[model samples]
Target: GAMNSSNYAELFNNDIKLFVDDTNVYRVTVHKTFEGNVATKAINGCIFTLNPKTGHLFLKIIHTSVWAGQKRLSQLAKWKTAEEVSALVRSLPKEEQPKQIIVTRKAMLDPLEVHMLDFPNIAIRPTELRLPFSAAMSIDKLSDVVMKATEPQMVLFNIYDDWLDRISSYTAFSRLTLLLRALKTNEESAKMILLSDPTITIKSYHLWPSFTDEQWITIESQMRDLILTEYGRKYNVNISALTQTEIKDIILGQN
Candidate 1:
């Protein structure tokens, strides 16, 4: 048996009415007549909505400051699951349905645990998006650096396919050795590096959160061409001209 307003005199002393809204959505509006110590002949409203398609019932409580009204509502309305509410809708006679069938505290503030049934008799539970215990590591930022640093010739060897392994210490060391040797031996390369624009840097390439794999490929390809070209070589000129603190910061994975 569902608990209605009759048992709770303080909150729901007035009238609970059910009807369909203008958009044809099911609505249960609680018109409460106040009966507390000082307050009398006063009416406050609460609304509950049920989406017919999804079968999800949600309470629309406007004034969040009033805990007494909120607590009483939780006690007054009860049901097992949305499926039960759906069943209630089907069981009742068509005309009598709106007239009849009706739908926490410091504990109310806590996250609710619900067991929802999915397709083919599968029971599903929600997993928190942000796990509290440990922060998850992100690889996209490292991938960006690796993709930018590696040569296009190396990319031809399917480096982007197995790109994760290319960011290893050995590969980084070899690349650094090659760069240093090329800078030392080739004066024009060193001159090219020194003459490049200091203002253009990695931050100019704005990586996005909602970017797809194709977008990433396009960006990475652009980065490869830019690093190879004389004009775009000025972009990361700061890499060649990095100060001691900047080198330290990069090694420490800061800034």
Candidate 2:
């Protein structure tokens, strides 16, 4: 797709401001599309944010269609396995065990459903599981752990739920863009906090000090330029730079 100047302007205008020791909360929404027999439209997305200095993280499911597909796959597997098991049990001889073998066809029909009802008995239930514990036990525990541990500086977030399956790409790109922009804008006056991750395809970045609204606007424009340039090169999508009018519209909530 060709670059849309207005979209870049809108994104830059909404770029969050940063402050030293201050909380900067962000609600990031990512969009993605898929094509196949389903031909779904924008069925994948995520919302997440981090507190500027405290490093607190929050993420929530926004939307997803991949989970529905997974559910259907599971259901099909269950029914197929059930049919196979029913056939195997039927092969057992009535003469060998007359008391158990005199069942009618109706009794064996949908044997998967019957077996599903008996799941509680066959399943192994765990009474207790041991979890690893760390001794650093205070607000400073995070800093202490980081200081002592040999691992690189990073925030490890384990995202749960099925929605993440589809939107992971968008989420990764958006997060890297946001954090890198924050660092670039605030690098002069504040300390930059390095961000790291082992699994994300996106690159890690740093976060810097606070910015005034006007300063933030300028930084956002520059950041948008960098993001659009990188994304365009990688995805073959032409992303235009932001304009002042579009930025104004975004700040004014004028669509």
Candidate 3:
């Protein structure tokens, strides 16, 4: 059944009134006469008691993975042979194994093999977009350079799936290779790089609140000027021609 604040209050009040003797004794312990009366009311009207069976069902549904996993394992425990257990474990998907006893047992028994097979099950698509720096470097190599530069910090790399929309996906495996290279080189200088589609914009947001007004203005201007110069050279787009207000409007989504 559904739970509410009133249900909890009534349950708690009844437990309080059960140990108390009279109004004076209850008031002395509770620090108020109103509290004692509320407790007595709750005790007298406690026919609307909490249902333990419904509460257990609610908890089971909320913690489905933990409870369901145990239930699956209990079912598997009834089987005798290794073949029967192995077949049962094989029937279940790797993601569901966390709750299943026999599946967990198989994973512990052969961790390397189980993990290798489950690798694809745990894979997630990348969120950021990527473009080639140049023809000399493969897409993977370009991603490696950026990732290495941000070593220890996480990085994701994805191909430019949509030039106009900038839809991209990345991989942890790709970042692993890139991070090692970046750490080795110690290349900290921000360099101008080419994108596969020159018309597609690359935007960044700086959210640091510690900067003084002058410092913020200087950094923003320098960065914008640098970006405009670099992109203008490649794409022949006169981004620098836009006024400060126009640029701010473009970036901040203001008119």
Candidate 4:
């Protein structure tokens, strides 16, 4: 069996600017060929932006092989080295080379030390989303809480549906009890807030559990009905409607 030889070629490069432009996007292709001469083209060899204000290079997109076949192809071609990429960019006479390269943390899984050349910088700015529920209080005042919490070069996301499963188990009265207790005693509710946002670290907001707005409204409505039902059962009366003040006192258990 003859040993396989792999080859890679830079297929195309495009500099995209809209009619009314503030941002310039650049794309370079990664084309791979095994011994048979069949070439697999990966679209994003490098996707970058030259900051208009600062003139810094931000490599926003990078691609690496993941599947078994792609991995084998990557091993054959040896995914384009940083040095090669640097040379490729340097060859571009039109685009000026940048001093600092600000790469989004996701693309570079491992940092490369390229024989002491180029200011290859990696920074991961994280954004934290605080939903309406803070531990001690129901934060109904603000609908969405967005903040930068910061992160590592490693890109990780919390994407499990288990939180929904856990919260869904609570009964109507049980759900109301959770909210009421959370409101009064400052107890933690079932941690069911699922955030699908990216590049942000999800941390605890004091004992507050995460929940979606829909879930919040659901429990909120449940509490109202359960309160009315319980109040009617206790007083032996069919009370169809109640004021917010009356509901507040009922929640307080004073009347």
Best by TM-score: 2
CA lDDT of each prediction against the hidden true structure:
0.28, 0.30, 0.26, 0.32
lDDT of 2 by residue, 29-54 (tens): 35454543433332222222222222
Which candidate achieves the best lDDT against the true structure? 4
Cα deviation at 81, candidate 3, in Å, is 40
Query: How close to the true structure is residue 54 of candidate 3, measured as C-alpha lDDT?
Result: 16
Q: Estimate candidate 3's RMSD in Å.
A: 28.0
Q: What lDDT score is found at residue 203 in candidate 2? A: 18
Every model's TM-score: 0.15, 0.22, 0.20, 0.21
Q: Which residues of candidate 4, in runs, are more than 4 Å off?
A: 1-46, 54-84, 92-95, 106-112, 115-255
For each candidate in turn, give its C-alpha RMSD to the true structure in angstroms.
25.4, 22.6, 28.0, 22.8
Query: Candidate 3 — which pairs collide?
Result: 69-99, 126-170, 148-182
CA lDDT for candidate 1: 0.28
Q: What ranges in model 1 sit over 4 Å off?
A: 1-37, 40-47, 52-74, 77-255
For candidate 4, what's the RMSD? 22.8
What TM-score, to 2 decimals, does candidate 1 have?
A: 0.15
Clashes of 2: 2
Candidate 2: give the clashing pairs. Answer: 3-238, 18-210
Q: Put down candidate 3 lDDT per residue, 1-255, tens digits, no spaces.
A: 212223323322212111100111001112336546533111100000011111100000011122233434332222212222234335547543222111112222233233335434322111111211111122334333432442112122222212213211122212222322222222221122222134434333211122333543453444444434544565676775867776544332111
Model 3 error, position 149 (Å): 15
Write the candidate numbers in order of decreasing TM-score.
2, 4, 3, 1
Question: Order of candidates by lDDT, top first?
Answer: 4, 2, 1, 3
lDDT of 4 by residue, 60-87 (tens): 2233332225444333222233333354
